């Protein structure tokens, strides 16, 4: 089992479309009813859903937000009735310090909800977090929740889908929020970086479609856990096989781009997952780990041949000081198999360091002139000084040095 903590407008939407994808996959009706064709289903549902006496299924989700508008719109959607009104929380009434201050203020009810959800699962495995690191809501609230959660639950995993601000496109106060959120991520987060720049780049070459792609990534990541097989039957198995990450998915094709039914082997897919173009995020930098989850018919002989050929062709580079993985799953029996075989890749690669070097460069490009610090001084945390900022910057520098 698992819980999802989505914050800010970004996280709220991310959750909306993630649950849309999930209910599509598992044959869950918009109202929580189960379709007749899926009555005898074999798919495991406990992982993301828990059924109710009324036979309806409820997501293990909690909605958090500093503002009402987004969630109010969500509850006007056809999927509104699905969520649990008890879990959803809205502030009665864009800065990280303010977000953390509110988090300190509204500890009690949030952790009440979290405890209630936790006690309903026998074998909870970890946490899932969806948020944006730039905006005031996501950054600060996620920081506070991560801190108090790592404190509260020292034996549960914490996974996040953190969305990073666009850089080629010029939050004016993004450097501070990003740097602080990164501090908290290093200091508490167990383990999926995301950026609007490269994401929209691949989308080209509304937020609805972008986050549909993101939800696709999340669902494909959690597929095998959802669909038990032989190997990789747990999230901890995933994490151990890799341990910051980046992702790529081959069949990112429009509903109109099915006309080119290209004979898609496993070799061509796994190859495509390697190119920098498909890496959805934007010094002979090299890899640390690679995982490829493959959906559809697959012959392990083909997998071995592809691995052999790629190894000989040396299209990849590895650390000199240490000695990939190809897991196979099964598609949901419901969504059309427009793709003969499909592939998702999650990897750890040193080049990601550059991200922080940019943000650090951004942050250093402001701290020398004290820009937009007036609001921060208002909050208690930065009321006296900003040693928090210095510690966070040095922590990020240490991480970059370690990479």
């Amino acid at each position: 089992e698992i819980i999802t903590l989505q914050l800010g407008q970004c996280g709220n939407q991310i959750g909306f479309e993630f649950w849309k994808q999930l209910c599509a996959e598992h044959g869950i009706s918009p109202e929580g009813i189960v379709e007749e064709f899926a009555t005898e289903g074999t798919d495991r549902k406990d992982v993301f859903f828990y059924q109710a006496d009324d036979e309806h299924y409820i997501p293990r989700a909690v909605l958090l937000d500093l503002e009402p508008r987004v969630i109010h719109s969500i509850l006007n959607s056809p999927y509104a009735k699905l969520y649990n009104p008890e879990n959803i929380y809205l502030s009665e009434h864009n800065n990280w310090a303010s977000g953390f201050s509110q988090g300190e203020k509204i500890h009690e009810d949030i952790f009440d909800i979290i405890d209630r959800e936790a006690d309903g699962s026998d074998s909870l495995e970890g946490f899932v977090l969806c948020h944006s690191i730039a905006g005031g809501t996501g950054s600060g609230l996620g920081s506070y929740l991560l801190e108090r959660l790592n404190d509260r639950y020292p034996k549960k995993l914490v996974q996040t889908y953190s969305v990073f601000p666009n850089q080629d496109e010029m939050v004016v106060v993004q450097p501070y929020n990003s740097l602080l959120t990164l501090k908290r991520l290093t200091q508490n987060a167990d383990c999926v970086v995301l950026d609007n720049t490269a994401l929209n780049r691949i989308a080209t070459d509304s937020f609805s479609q972008i986050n549909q792609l993101v939800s696709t990534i999340m669902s494909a990541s959690t597929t095998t856990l959802r669909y038990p097989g032989y190997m990789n039957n747990d999230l901890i198995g995933l994490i151990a096989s890799l341990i910051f990450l980046m992702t790529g998915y081959t069949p990112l094709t429009t509903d109109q781009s099915v006309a080119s039914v290209r004979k898609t082997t496993v070799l061509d897919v796994m190859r495509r997952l390697l190119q920098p173009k498909n890496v959805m995020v934007s010094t002979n930098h090299c890899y640390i780990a690679i995982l490829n989850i493959i959906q559809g018919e697959v012959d392990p002989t083909q997998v071995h041949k592809s691995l052999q050929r790629i190894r000989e062709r040396k299209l990849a580079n590895f650390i000199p000081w240490g000695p990939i993985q190809v897991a196979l799953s099964r598609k949901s029996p419901y969504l059309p198999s427009a793709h003969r075989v499909s592939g998702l890749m999650m990897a750890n690669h040193t080049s990601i360091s550059s991200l922080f070097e940019r943000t650090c460069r951004q942050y250093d490009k402001l701290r020398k002139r004290e820009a937009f610090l007036e609001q921060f001084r208002k909050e208690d945390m930065f009321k006296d000084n900003f040693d928090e900022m210095d510690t966070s910057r040095e922590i990020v520098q240490q991480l970059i040095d370690e990479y």
Binding site: T42, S123, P228, Y230, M231, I236, G322, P323, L328
Partner: protein, 255 residues
């Protein structure tokens, strides 16, 4: 059709060949502490009460034949407490001519060999969360975990998944029982050949250092981690050596 056989063997792959990890991830999670005790100290009425529960809670509940799993603590290990545990299965007369005691201990030989590799990498992966808050022991754990994960993927998606798919098709073209008895014992003597079960006893000693390594890390030194590296890497260069001299058995090196 009546007292079906093909829908009766899939109830064995679910348990003996470990095709469903939803019943294991939930069974060892219950009977872990009560198996590390030495043998002739655990009460069998307790394990059966844990097996009977691990099924119905997991996704193996949708099975007509789940009431035929019995615990059978063997005397001798795979030549105690944990290394002497294995399921046992009972069938009626008409289906017994196919799956008999001669061809069920073989199902019980290639299960323990897959419960042993499944047990070590369940714990060797568990030390990974203990160290997640002195810094050179991680690069050895990466060398060990990436070896057992590379044996299991070879033992499930390369030997026991392809050979089983043959048997499913090789039973539709059968003409008599004297042939079904040929395609079954023809499936077992093939698995125990492509697996290391038939010698390669250095595998047993190689897994011995891995469990010891997890133990050492379980007590939380700087001079013994480097000893295990020189010890474990020496046995691995022996495994890759003998697995090369052969006429499959050659595709394992690429794994």
């Amino acid at each position: 059709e009546e007292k079906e056989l093909v829908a009766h063997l899939r109830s064995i792959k679910r348990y003996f060949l470990m095709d469903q990890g939803d019943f294991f991830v939930h069974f060892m999670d219950l009977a872990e502490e009560e198996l590390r005790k030495p043998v002739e100290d655990i009460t069998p009425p307790r394990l059966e009460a844990l097996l009977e529960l691990a099924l119905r809670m997991s996704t193996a509940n949708t099975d007509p034949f789940k009431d035929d799993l019995k615990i059978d603590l063997m005397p001798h290990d795979l030549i105690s407490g944990l290394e002497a545990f294995s399921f046992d299965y009972i069938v009626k007369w008409p289906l017994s001519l196919i799956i008999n005691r001669k061809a069920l201990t073989r199902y019980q030989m290639l299960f323990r060999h897959m419960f042993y590799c499944k047990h070590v990498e369940r714990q060797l992966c568990s030390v990974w969360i203990s160290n997640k808050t002195f810094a050179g022991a991680f690069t050895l754990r990466q060398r060990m975990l990436n070896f057992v994960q590379n044996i299991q993927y070879y033992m499930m998606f390369e030997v026991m998944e392809p050979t089983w798919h043959i048997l499913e098709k090789n039973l539709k073209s059968a003409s008599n029982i004297d042939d079904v008895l040929g395609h079954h014992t023809g499936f077992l003597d093939t698995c125990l050949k492509d697996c290391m079960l038939t010698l390669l006893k250095v595998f047993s000693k190689l897994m011995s250092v891995c469990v010891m390594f997890t133990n050492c890390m379980q007590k939380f030194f700087e001079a013994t981690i480097n000893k295990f590296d020189k010890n474990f890497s020496a046995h691995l260069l022996d495994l890759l050596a003998r697995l090369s001299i052969y006429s499959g058995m050659a595709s394992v090196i690429s794994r």
